[PDB]
Nucleic acid binder design. Structure first.
Ligand SMILES: [Mg+2]
Ligand SMILES: [Mg+2]
Ligand SMILES: [Mg+2]
Ligand SMILES: [Mg+2]
Ligand SMILES: [Mg+2]
Ligand SMILES: [Mg+2]
Ligand SMILES: [Mg+2]
Ligand SMILES: [Mg+2]
Ligand SMILES: [Mg+2]
Ligand SMILES: [Mg+2]
Ligand SMILES: [Mg+2]
Ligand SMILES: [Mg+2]
Ligand SMILES: [Mg+2]
Ligand SMILES: [Mg+2]
Ligand SMILES: [Mg+2]
Ligand SMILES: [Mg+2]
Ligand SMILES: [Mg+2]
Ligand SMILES: [Mg+2]
Ligand SMILES: [Mg+2]
Ligand SMILES: [Mg+2]
Ligand SMILES: [Mg+2]
Ligand SMILES: [Mg+2]
Ligand SMILES: [Mg+2]
Ligand SMILES: [Mg+2]
Ligand SMILES: [Mg+2]
Ligand SMILES: [Mg+2]
Ligand SMILES: [Mg+2]
Ligand SMILES: [Mg+2]
Ligand SMILES: [Mg+2]
Ligand SMILES: [Mg+2]
Ligand SMILES: [Mg+2]
Ligand SMILES: [Mg+2]
Ligand SMILES: [Mg+2]
Ligand SMILES: [Mg+2]
Ligand SMILES: [Mg+2]
Ligand SMILES: [Mg+2]
Ligand SMILES: [Mg+2]
Ligand SMILES: [Mg+2]
Ligand SMILES: [Mg+2]
Ligand SMILES: [Mg+2]
Ligand SMILES: [Mg+2]
Ligand SMILES: [Mg+2]
Ligand SMILES: [Mg+2]
Ligand SMILES: [Mg+2]
Ligand SMILES: [Mg+2]
Ligand SMILES: [Mg+2]
Ligand SMILES: [Mg+2]
Ligand SMILES: [Mg+2]
Ligand SMILES: [Mg+2]
Ligand SMILES: [Mg+2]
Ligand SMILES: [Mg+2]
Ligand SMILES: [Mg+2]
Ligand SMILES: [Mg+2]
Ligand SMILES: [Mg+2]
Ligand SMILES: [Mg+2]
Ligand SMILES: [Mg+2]
Ligand SMILES: [Mg+2]
Ligand SMILES: [Mg+2]
Ligand SMILES: [Mg+2]
Ligand SMILES: [Mg+2]
Ligand SMILES: [Mg+2]
Ligand SMILES: [Mg+2]
Ligand SMILES: [Mg+2]
Lengths: 46, 62, 27, 103, 77, 94
RNA sequence: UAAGGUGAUAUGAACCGUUAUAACCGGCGAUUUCCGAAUGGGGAAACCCAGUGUGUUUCGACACACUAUCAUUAACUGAAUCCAUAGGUUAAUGAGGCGAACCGGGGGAACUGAAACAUCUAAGUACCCCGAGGAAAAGAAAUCAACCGAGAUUCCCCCAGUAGCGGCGAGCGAACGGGGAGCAGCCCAGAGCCUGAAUCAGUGUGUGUGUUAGUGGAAGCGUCUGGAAAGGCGCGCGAUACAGGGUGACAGCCCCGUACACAAAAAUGCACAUGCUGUGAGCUCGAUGAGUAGGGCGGGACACGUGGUAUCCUGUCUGAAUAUGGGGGGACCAUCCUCCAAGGCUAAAUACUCCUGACUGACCGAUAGUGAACCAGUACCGUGAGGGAAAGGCGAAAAGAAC
RNA sequence: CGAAGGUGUGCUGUGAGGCAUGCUGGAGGUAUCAGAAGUGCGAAUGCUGACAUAAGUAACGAUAAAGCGGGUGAAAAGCCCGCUCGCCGGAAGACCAAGGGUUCCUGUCCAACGUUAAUCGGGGCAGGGUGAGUCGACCCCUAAGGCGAGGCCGAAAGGCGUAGUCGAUGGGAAACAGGUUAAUAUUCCUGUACUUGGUGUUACUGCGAAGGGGGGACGGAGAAGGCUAUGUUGGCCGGGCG
RNA sequence: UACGGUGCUGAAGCAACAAAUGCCCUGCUUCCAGGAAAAGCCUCUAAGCAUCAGGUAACAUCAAAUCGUACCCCAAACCG
């Protein structure tokens, strides 16, 4: 069957990437939460 | 050797730095092959290059 | 592996079960 | 500011060699010394073709705690604790007994 | 923004209270209007989004005093 | 003119290989491990100066580092850059 | 400061050093790739593409600097349009972003409780947003009191679960006054006179006290058991040091320390003192914060849910007197008392702990305690936000088993 | 001269319990009298870990199919070589994009993985391997759309959007054949080409844009005609005479 | 000949027919539902430049960087 994850790096980075997070206010709050939790991989972005 | 090198000119320090870098190249190719059996010379050279760049930043712009 | 056990529990229940298998409304 | 140093002759206070004497060969950073000829163990040395070792039961010296040794005072023939004083503006060691400077 | 440039009036929040005293949040907006004021000194018109209270204030203090206050406040006009 | 200090930091090591020995004996081409930011012109100037030999052309490629496991802990080696330096005919190098 | 070192797993190699530029520690410095506020333009973060200028060139081209936006200021320029203005351009200074809690403010729930529920409660809570500081805020009476008087603000204990509020239900809940911590008052709405006079700020210097490396630092032997003594049995000694930890079993006298005594080239904090810079001090005569107070309507805050409801705020419409005047004293009037709004500033006591140091625990001791004693916000899961583990101990010493 | 803990035994108390001791263990334990509690577990379709049961049962993943000889090896139904057989063949062949990210090749190993064995492997370990002026990207251009100086609006955050600037899935210069590596090739080599920028001479002389125009530049269906790829037959050459 | 390979040499290398869903064809015919943009490219001049700059023409010379390129890709390597 066709499953729900059909990957595309371009769409992955445009949707969930670093600059998409840094663009908006709420996306910047996400990176503050992940730095506070101490995430190694802060985003998708390689 | 900072005391010895302080009593030198800018052009003399640039000459020494260029001779150090040629020695560093010849050591790096020698250790690339199995010829180099004195591994400490790479460290001695890397420090002496740092001393020359340091004294150059002291004499110039300071 | 209890992490491969995490899979086990996390989604051998998230498989969700299909359902009762007798078309019976005891109605 | 170390009391027991490298070339010092010490006596052994505790252990299976309580009373023996020897020279320090090297002091270790872990607070241990290797005294020449005392704490002997028999290591089963594995042969190496490189390095040309046939491999056998080599008897060699093990480290020991500095607390377990003391500097032998050859004058008294005993162990003395070590103090520090300044002579000529230079920190020297001396025996706590007889206040004599360790040389 | 519903802000009088002169008085600094601003939409405040309150309640609609019903007969049964049912409270719903509402807003109280100022009566803002854009008006061209003839400044005789600069010999020109200046448009201000101003409430009617502010128009009574300009009619009382004078427009030169008010534009002095807006410059001392640091507000463009 | 590329500065001599950069030209001294460009070349890292020769790369020994069966393909390198073949290219050295047939096409008269040496194979070098170079600095990663080094370009072809920087390489051609370095070989033409530090080895005193005439370079015809330089072909480059980037080597991706392998993923290794020291014990059970994962790790990744560094990406490095490789240069096929074609010498002119008659020129020789150790 | 030093006789030993070249961080760890983790040996080894090749070396350095031993009386002082080995190493190590601290202070001041230097370098400080790329992304990221990211700031030369762009961008799917760690990438792409430039411009101008100054230099070099073996003419192939190299190197360096600058170039964001906004605010404010200054200069120059400059439309419709004559002047002008808008606009443009340069330059200078500043900001921008992150961050635990505390703080002030703008907005602002519901579950729930009421044994249902709508007023009410939860609750101005959670949450979102803005801004600041080491604290903030408030603050020097248009206050309380009661005909006696007190004398800014903030915090604590009482008053008091009282008075009251309230589908007078559930529930909410003061104040006056008293005891304490801490205490500090000032300026402009304006002229003069005397002139630099108080105080504050900055910047130097000097002194003191810290901090950022450190130094010295007491006094035990014998014997028995035992693998090993620090234990037992004898006999001594120290103590302004019997805090603690380690050492082959439980050590005041083995080691590190501790008590105590000191120590800083350099940087820096806090005090004083003083120099310089700026700042004005005091006296007299005045003046005394208008679309404001108050009012009408609608809301909100005060313990006070519009009630008989004072007082405070204001979205809207209005609208005074102004020292012979006005406000308040819980509807309201009269008398009396008290205070002077519509401009500001202000320490302390108070709140908190991302972080550092010391110490403590009738706190835990590996299914506990942080999620995490261990390479844990990891592995892993999820598109993503996000979720989120398990897993400690040979022995005194690897002497980690040659053959 | 052997603590706690573990395992037995004996004794004892009305009970919760207590005492002594053997073995293990190899370093802590604690009377009494008071004090404080994370103070007593069999159940909560309780939580975590371990071990059972069914049970050496079902199954071992397309009914495309295997057989033999030889080799290696401790060992061969499964590996290698070989002869046969069978299966796909508009695919079960070949080339790519997306995506993955070293799975590629060579050597060596067989503990684990592989639904069996394994000498094998996309498995473990070590080493090696990806070569471009013409391919693609980058780059010039824009679409939908996004961002958006100023700006307009809005309690705040922020929303929209001008100039602009991003954004391909589309437009825009140019390389072919043969050979070769264990593994790369339109990238290396041989041969033969091509394109765009530069500087520099020589002749000639209207150059110039952020502007104007042209072009780029565009639909569906249908009908044939001309061709080629390619195939068949003949010829030709080499071999054969069963 | 390491039996894997490597080296040398090398014949013929034509014709007819059939023939695409590929090419001419971004064509032609026809229909209505009426079928992207911008740059490169060509050209025109504007201010400007006036014999300088620039332009095309030939020739010569130099440069063409950087990144990807292994391997699977209807699959045991992608999503399950
Ligand atoms: Mg409500
Ligand atoms: Mg080439
Ligand atoms: Mg390439
Ligand atoms: Mg080391
Ligand atoms: Mg940018
Ligand atoms: Mg930038
Ligand atoms: Mg751009
Ligand atoms: Mg409710
Ligand atoms: Mg209820
Ligand atoms: Mg304040
Ligand atoms: Mg009085
Ligand atoms: Mg000391
Ligand atoms: Mg001592
Ligand atoms: Mg000891
Ligand atoms: Mg023990
Ligand atoms: Mg007043
Ligand atoms: Mg009023
Ligand atoms: Mg009233
Ligand atoms: Mg009202
Ligand atoms: Mg009013
Ligand atoms: Mg009033
Ligand atoms: Mg009254
Ligand atoms: Mg006041
Ligand atoms: Mg735990
Ligand atoms: Mg345990
Ligand atoms: Mg993931
Ligand atoms: Mg026993
Ligand atoms: Mg216990
Ligand atoms: Mg027991
Ligand atoms: Mg026991
Ligand atoms: Mg006790
Ligand atoms: Mg319990
Ligand atoms: Mg139980
Ligand atoms: Mg029960
Ligand atoms: Mg149970
Ligand atoms: Mg069974
Ligand atoms: Mg059965
Ligand atoms: Mg059966
Ligand atoms: Mg069966
Ligand atoms: Mg099968
Ligand atoms: Mg067989
Ligand atoms: Mg088979
Ligand atoms: Mg076969
Ligand atoms: Mg078939
Ligand atoms: Mg692998
Ligand atoms: Mg393979
Ligand atoms: Mg292999
Ligand atoms: Mg086997
Ligand atoms: Mg198996
Ligand atoms: Mg493999
Ligand atoms: Mg392009
Ligand atoms: Mg657009
Ligand atoms: Mg927009
Ligand atoms: Mg804007
Ligand atoms: Mg673009
Ligand atoms: Mg495209
Ligand atoms: Mg291949
Ligand atoms: Mg055009
Ligand atoms: Mg069409
Ligand atoms: Mg043909
Ligand atoms: Mg026949
Ligand atoms: Mg390929
Ligand atoms: Mg296939």
């Amino acid at each position: 069957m066709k499953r729900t994850f059909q990957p595309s790096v371009l769409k992955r980075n445009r949707s969930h990437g670093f600059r998409a997070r840094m663009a908006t206010k709420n996306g910047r709050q996400v990176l503050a939460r992940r730095r506070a939790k101490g995430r190694a991989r802060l985003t998708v972005s390689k | 050797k900072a005391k010895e090198l302080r009593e030198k000119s800018v052009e003399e320090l640039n000459t020494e730095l260029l001779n150090l870098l040629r020695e560093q190249f010849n050591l790096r190719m020698q250790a690339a092959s199995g010829q180099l059996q004195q591994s400490h010379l790479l460290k001695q050279v890397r420090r002496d290059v740092a001393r020359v760049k340091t004294l150059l930043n002291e004499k110039a712009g300071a | 592996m209890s992490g491969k056990m995490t899979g086990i529990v996390k989604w051998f229940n998230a498989d969700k079960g299909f359902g009762f298998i007798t078309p019976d409304d005891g109605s | 500011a170390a009391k027991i140093r490298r070339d010092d002759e010490v006596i052994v206070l505790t252990g299976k060699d309580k009373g023996k004497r020897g020279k320090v060969k090297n002091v270790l950073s872990s607070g241990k010394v290797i005294v020449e000829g005392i704490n002997l163990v028999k290591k089963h040395q594995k042969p190496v073709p490189a390095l040309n070792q046939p491999g056998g039961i080599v008897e060699k010296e093990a480290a020991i705690q500095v607390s377990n040794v003391a500097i032998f005072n050859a004058a008294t023939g005993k162990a003395d604790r070590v103090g520090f004083r300044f002579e000529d503006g230079k920190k020297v060691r001396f025996f706590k007994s007889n206040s004599e400077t360790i040389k | 923004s519903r802000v009088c440039q002169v008085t600094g009036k601003r939409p405040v929040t309150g309640n609609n209270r019903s007969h049964a005293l049912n409270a719903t949040k509402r807003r109280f907006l100022p009566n803002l209007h854009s008006h061209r004021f003839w400044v005789e000194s600069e010999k020109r018109f200046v448009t201000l989004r101003v409430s009617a209270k502010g128009m009574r204030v300009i009619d009382k203090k004078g427009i030169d005093t008010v534009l002095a206050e807006l410059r001392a406040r640091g507000e463009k006009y | 003119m590329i500065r001599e200090e950069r030209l001294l930091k460009v070349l890292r090591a020769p790369h020994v290989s069966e393909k390198a020995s073949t290219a050295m004996e047939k096409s008269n081409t040496i194979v070098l491990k170079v600095a990663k930011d080094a370009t072809k012109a920087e390489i051609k100037a370095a070989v033409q100066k530090l080895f005193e030999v005439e370079v015809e052309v330089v072909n480059t490629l980037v080597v991706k580092g392998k993923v290794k496991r020291h014990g059970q802990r994962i790790g990744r080696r560094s990406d490095w850059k490789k240069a096929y330096v074609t010498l002119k005919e008659g020129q020789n190098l150790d």
